[PDB]
Amino acid sequence: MILNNQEWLLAIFKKKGLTPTGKLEFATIDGIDSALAQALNEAFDSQVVSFND
Amino acid sequence: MILNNQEWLLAIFKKKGLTPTGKLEFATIDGIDSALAQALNEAFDSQVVSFND
């Protein structure tokens, strides 16, 4: 109990503050085409034909 | 009564479990055309003409 006169000192915490800058960064829509092209192939996979004709 | 200490053994059953594989098989829409072509013929069947003209 840190008591001086009629006031107490209870706790001291540590805080983290964030200050922004003007810079910005964004992703590109170019990879979505390749992602869709690769994803389409899984439809034809896992398919079998038991009897040849 | 199969009783050991304070434990009763009541019954034992056998159970069957299914574990999947990625393979798939599906039917074709090719035969539906032939089925419809054959089905259309029953409209003209069972029809008669009493008097020739």
Measured CA distances, B19 to A44, A48, B31, B37 (Å)? 22, 18, 32, 41
Taking the C-alpha atoms of residue A46 and residue A39, their distance in angstroms, rounded to an integer, is 13
Test the B interface: residue of A46, A49, A53 with most B CBs within 10 Å:
A46
Give this entry's resolution in angstroms.
3.3
Q: What are phi and psi of B52, to 5 degrees?
A: -75, 150
A32: its two tokens: 């979505």
- Which residues does residue B7 pair with via DSSP β-bridges, in sequence order? B4
Contact B2, B8 (CB under 8 A): yes
Taking the C-alpha atoms of residue B31 and residue B38, their distance in angstroms, rounded to an integer, is 11
Compare all CA atoms of chain B with the CA of A50 and give the residue at the minimum distance. Answer: B25
Q: In angstroms, what separates the C-alpha of B21 from chain A's closest C-alpha?
A: 9
- Which chain B residues contact residue A47 at CB under 8 A? 23-25
Q: Would you call A9 helix, strand, or coil by DSSP?
A: strand
Compare all CA atoms of chain B with the CA of A45 and give the residue at the minimum distance. Answer: B23
Determine, for residues B23 and A50 on separate chains, whether the beta-carbon distance falls below 8 Å. Answer: no
What Rg, from alpha-carbon coordinates, does chain A have?
A: 32
A12: its two tokens: 């001291």
Contact B25, A50 (CB under 8 A): yes
